């Protein structure tokens, strides 16, 4: 049971806490006396249950939980996939190819290029840039249930930071095991955010819509809207940077309406420690806190778009 409270700051009532200062009992190295230590969890990590406010971990009623080791890192490194003897991997080398159909210029290789396993949603990060015009690929364009994978030609510079000098409390749940709690925050209480150059994003989006009219009629209206709803991993730009798992609001990137014919875009980002990626139940990972302000610069190299069924099809 977590006896939590608001983080030390000064109002307003619209700050909705977000950060919780949880105090609780804990087992020490010995199997006798307990331990009254406190930690700092995000609101997305906790959930109240019905005297002061008492909470619990959001995964305790779903599955077990294991802490990620601080020795390993979640930094995506290039991985070449190779085929054994007697086998071979063919590579299509045309500048224009929607992934399906006959390929004019085919070459063979033993190992593919370095493909970094970057796990993200909505925005494709650190991927391979397309040739000439940006590419549009889909299993079935006529089917609005099939996703539309977009590949960029010019990368869109994106900057994400964690303006919170966190502290790692290493409380000892011995013998052997040790939990890494979040101590007090040094400095100002700020929220994570991502910046996208308004100039770059305007040209890139306008370069995509010109390719969308090649499939949805030359003189048609293309409108961009945010997600419909559901899980946090689907409605937000989920990614990893510096060990933390960000969840950014993409309502500022897909807020446009294109007809037939100087700063940065800041995006509200949330941070969750207890995650369950790949739609997996039974294995919940608690990402340990990271000391110091985290900064990362990535490449927006593609999008994952979906089309609505409301139609009115030959119009917009």
């Amino acid at each position, epitope marked *: 049971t977590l006896q939590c409270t608001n983080v*030390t*700051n*000064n*109002i*307003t009532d619209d700050m909705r806490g977000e950060l919780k200062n949880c105090s609780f009992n804990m087992t020490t190295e010995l199997r006798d006396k307990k331990q009254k230590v406190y930690s700092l969890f995000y609101r997305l990590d906790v959930v109240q249950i019905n005297s002061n406010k008492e909470y619990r971990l959001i995964n305790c009623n779903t599955s077990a939980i294991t802490q990620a080791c601080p020795k390993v890192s979640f930094e995506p490194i290039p991985i070449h996939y190779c085929a054994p003897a007697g086998f071979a991997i063919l590579k299509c080398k045309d500048k224009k190819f929607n992934g399906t159909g006959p390929c004019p210029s085919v070459s063979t290789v033993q190992c593919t290029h370095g493909i970094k396993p970057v796990v993200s949603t909505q925005l494709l990060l650190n991927g391979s840039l397309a040739e000439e015009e940006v590419m549009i690929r889909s299993e079935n364009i006529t089917n609005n249930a099939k996703n539309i994978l977009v590949q960029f030609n010019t990368p869109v510079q994106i900057n994400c930071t964690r*303006p919170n*000098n966190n502290t790692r409390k290493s409380i000892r749940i011995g013998p052997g095991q040790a939990f890494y709690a979040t101590g007090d925050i*040094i*400095g*100002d*209480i*700020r*929220q994570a*955010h991502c910046n996208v150059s308004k100039a770059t994003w305007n040209e890139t989006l306008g370069k995509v819509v010109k390719q969308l009219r090649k499939h949805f009629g030359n003189n048609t209206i293309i409108r961009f809207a945010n997600s419909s709803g559901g899980d946090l991993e689907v409605t937000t730009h989920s990614f990893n940077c510096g060990g933390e798992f960000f969840y950014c609001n993409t309502s500022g990137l897909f807020n446009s309406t294109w007809i037939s014919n100087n700063d940065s875009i*800041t995006l*509200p980002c949330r941070i969750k420690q207890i995650i369950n990626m790949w739609q997996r139940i039974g294995q919940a990972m608690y990402a340990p806190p990271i000391q110091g302000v985290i900064r990362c610069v990535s490449n927006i190299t593609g999008l994952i778009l979906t089309r609505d069924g409301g139609s009115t099809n030959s119009t917009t």
Partner: antibody
Amino acid sequence: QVHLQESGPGLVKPSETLSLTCNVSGTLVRDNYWSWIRQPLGKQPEWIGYVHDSGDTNYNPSLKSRVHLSLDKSKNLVSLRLTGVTAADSAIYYCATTKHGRRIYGVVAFKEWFTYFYMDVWGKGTSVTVSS
Amino acid sequence: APTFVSVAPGQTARITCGEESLGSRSVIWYQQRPGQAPSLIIYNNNDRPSGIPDRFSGSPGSTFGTTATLTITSVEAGDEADYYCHIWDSRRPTNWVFGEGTTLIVLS
């Protein structure tokens, strides 16, 4: 030049209503912020509250339900009212102009900032003693 | 509650007021001559208004975990007075009471 002058009764009975007035000369009371500061003998100054036009007026949470401020644009002066006075209110009340400032530490757009006030031009001050 | 700081003439005086910084601050300093009204010396950590010499400097409100410090170079007999501070912390509520003052003693 900016000259400020405070004037009051000097003596107020317990459980009564203290009324003070800050006569302002050299500037208009509508184009500035106005704050009141009191200070007991041998203690640190205590901020009472600031008053401004367009309804922008806030008080001291400790003296919230007893203090009242107002601005007379016709007579060009600042007023003060304190109901239910005690021996703890016996101090020296000052009238000073107030200039606002904005301290930015975050990203501005996310309201990651705060406004700070500071008095630059004070007055001579008035003496208020509470005794029966 | 009261504190004292004695500094020889021509030297450098240092004044500590308020609690330790928890966030980004905007410390406002004030000087109160005996028998007079408090006067503004330094607002916004280290910004002096018109009429105040550059001898008076304050610690920047960007250092986390330190107290507000008022530095007075070339200490003169005229600087002998009380000094209060108004702490504006982004982690602390609005302080409606100035910090406990510090008396500057000019020796000799």
